[PDB]
Amino acid sequence: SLVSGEKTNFNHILRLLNTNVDGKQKVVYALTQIKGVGRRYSNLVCKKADVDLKKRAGELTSEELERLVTIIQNPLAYKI
Amino acid sequence: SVQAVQVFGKKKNATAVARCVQGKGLIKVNGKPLKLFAPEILRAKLYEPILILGTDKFADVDIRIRVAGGGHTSQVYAVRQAIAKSIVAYYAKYVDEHSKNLLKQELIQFDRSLLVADPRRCEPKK
């Protein structure tokens, strides 16, 4: 009667750099919800961070979230 | 010497040359085969005359069709008219007149536009 539900707590409102509200929609549409980001821009962001587009928002780990924050912070030190 | 029957099909501005020769059974339209030439929803209107007359009637003929002019629906109607008129004229010319009459009977019992193109004249209520 013990099965690890270590992933089920993801329908919670995530926090990010400018908006403190970002639900579970998708990675690229969540980054579209982030203010100042376009859809192709978020696609470029996800492809740069090598996060799979199949994966949802809230299925991520903290280090992946943080490197997403760093690469939305600077778009030039990463190639573009 | 070789048996051949050429027939014409008409629509608004879609015309259809259909030349029928004794063959293995194939049917081509602009070279490409019949199951390929159409938008993917009018293929039943193409198969309507073959499906009425059965495949054994087309077992011996080989139909090559050219088409040009008009839009998609117009070309499809031109090809089905050319198919029906081709097989009826071939059966008129090279097999028995009774078989021709039975074929023309089944086709007219379905729809007359398979044989005689009825153009849309302008005659509104005068």
């Binding site: 329908n11 199949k54 949802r56 | -």
Partner: protein, 186 residues
């Protein structure tokens, strides 16, 4: 004869192929989770219950089709198992989490019959295969009860069986007489 079997895992189901053993199409329309994705005996329509209480039934072709046919949002609390009836192609059963199993007809937008009697989570269910047992449902709850209901009398359990363990799984036999209730260590 077909080449489809479905695996639900998380907020998405993944319809697999049998011949190729490659995930043929991943369906991720869900809101929260996906608990049981079962395709019809026909082999064209997948049903799945979400964690938000809704159940979605949608057509799936041999390739990439995810066309939502119907949705139901009556449970308002997680739906853990839905199953089709093996005989009737348009009737399905659903054990929710709260206290209920219920029989749905696919065209309708309301449950055909409602069945209560359990006291905790109910989380396994099955139809009774066989010729004589046309309309008999069996469900195992977490209240250590396996109940079998007739679908002609919408009252209580026609038969009940009380174990001492949380009852996790149930299958009937194809013979129709005997049944396996998987509960705890035995």
């Amino acid at each position: 004869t077909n080449d489809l079997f479905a695996v639900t895992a998380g907020p998405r189901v993944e319809i697999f192929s049998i011949r190729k053993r490659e995930p043929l199409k991943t369906i991720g329309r869900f809101d929260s989770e996906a608990h049981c994705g079962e395709i019809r005996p026909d082999g064209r329509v997948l049903v799945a219950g979400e964690d938000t209480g809704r159940m979605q039934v949608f057509d799936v072709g041999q390739g990439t089709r995810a066309v939502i046919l119907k949705t139901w949002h009556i449970h308002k609390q997680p739906v853990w198992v839905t199953k089709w009836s093996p005989t009737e192609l348009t009737t399905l059963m659903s054990c929710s989490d709260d206290k209920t199993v219920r029989l749905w007809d696919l065209p309708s937008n309301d449950p055909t019959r409602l069945f209560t009697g359990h006291t905790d989570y109910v989380r396994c269910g099955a139809f009774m295969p066989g010729s004589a047992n046309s309309n008999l449902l069996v469900s195992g709850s977490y209240d250590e009860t396996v109940r079998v209901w007739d679908a002609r009398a919408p009252g209580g359990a026609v038969m009940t069986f009380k174990h001492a363990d949380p009852i996790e799984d149930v299958l009937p036999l194809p013979s129709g007489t005997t049944l396996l209730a998987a509960s705890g260590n035995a």
